């Protein structure tokens, strides 16, 4: 579809980030271990608890106070989690388009949103006490989004 | 009634260079006195705790540039 001059020159995915979000812990410290348990249930890696970088006002924040979580999937764990998210997400979402018409930042990023609906696709709503959301970005070797549109069409719902 | 609130000053510290370029020095003499590092040390020159530059051996002293905008001091041997 692009007529590549050499087979080494072809676009491919590189890394997927499973960064969750804030989870502002003024009193959600027990939920934070459960939010870590939610990511440890969603993905097969203990996520890096990303702490804050400032102490800004009008917010429950200071130097420290770990306010995030992220796990990086690169190899076969990225290859296995991408196949199950191709099937057990869109049937669990039931949307029209599914992600967006254009969500890249000029580089080829997916940046799909989540609102705790396809989350816990293994266990039912038994222990969950609050809603949440994940952010699944797709880092790839595409130069621009138009070349990435040929990559996003393969097993995608643009 | 009027008054002011500015009368304070510190005692001045006698900074700057102490030996000249081309001059023979003895092996422990202070070359330059500074806050921070306006001039780096070069050959046979030590750098003190309060950033004072001093000579290791006795010889003649040369000031010389280091990069684009950096300066250093060296002491060379034969007199």
């Amino acid at each position: 579809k692009f007529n590549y001059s050499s087979v080494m020159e072809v676009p491919k995915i590189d890394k997927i980030v499973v960064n969750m979000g804030v989870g502002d812990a003024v009193q959600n410290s027990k939920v934070l271990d459960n939010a870590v348990e939610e990511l440890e249930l969603i993905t097969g890696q203990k996520p890096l608890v990303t702490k804050a970088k400032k102490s800004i006002a009008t917010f429950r924040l200071r130097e420290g106070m770990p306010i995030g979580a992220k796990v990086t999937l690169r190899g076969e764990r990225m290859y296995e989690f991408l196949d199950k998210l191709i099937s057990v997400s869109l049937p669990r979402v039931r949307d029209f388009q599914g992600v967006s018409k254009k969500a890249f930042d000029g580089r080829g990023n997916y940046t799909l949103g989540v609102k705790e609906q396809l989350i816990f696709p293994e266990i039912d709503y038994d222990k969950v006490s609050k809603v949440r959301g994940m952010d699944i970005v797709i880092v790839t070797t595409a130069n621009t989004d138009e070349e990435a549109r040929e990559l996003l069409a393969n097993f995608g719902m643009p | 009634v009027s008054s002011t609130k500015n009368g304070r000053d510190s005692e001045s510290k006698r900074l700057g260079a102490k030996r000249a370029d081309g001059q023979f020095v003895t092996g422990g003499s202070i070359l330059y006195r500074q806050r921070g590092t306006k001039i780096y040390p070069g050959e046979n020159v030590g750098r003190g705790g309060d950033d004072t530059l001093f000579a290791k051996i006795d010889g003649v002293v040369k000031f010389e540039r280091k990069g684009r905008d950096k300066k250093q001091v060296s002491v060379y041997a034969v007199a």
């Binding site: 590189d14 890394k15 580089r107 790839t140 595409a142 | -």
Partner: protein
């Protein structure tokens, strides 16, 4: 997209931070190490004149086999000390390049200690 940086230009930033307290002075010369992917190199340098003195290699025909990539590195360390034994078999300074003192760099240094050098 995603940009991979080459490993060699990151090494030289690490190498220049190392070689700032370290030099060869012709009483105590410097040997540095360069490994590419398939060979191991070694070279004695006096930094005061900028003149090198000795050299050994993995791709040299005198030492050329397919042992381990590590037993290869040992034979280089035995090789460089013999030419260092001709003159200046005194203490030297080991320049680790920009590498971790581990594995193939480490096996080169152990072979140089066990064959006459005094570092």
């Amino acid at each position: 997209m995603i940009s991979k940086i080459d490993k060699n230009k990151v090494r030289l930033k690490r190498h220049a931070r190392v070689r700032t307290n370290l030099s060869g002075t012709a009483e105590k010369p410097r040997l540095n190490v360069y490994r590419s992917n398939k060979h191991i190199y070694a070279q004695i340098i006096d930094d005061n004149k900028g003149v090198t003195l000795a050299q050994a290699s993995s791709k040299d025909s005198d030492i050329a086999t397919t042992a381990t990539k590590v037993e290869l590195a040992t034979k280089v360390g035995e090789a460089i000390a013999k030419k260092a034994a001709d003159k200046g078999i005194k203490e030297i300074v080991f320049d680790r390049g920009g590498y971790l003192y581990h594995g193939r760099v480490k096996a080169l240094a152990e072979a140089a200690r066990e064959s006459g050098l005094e570092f």
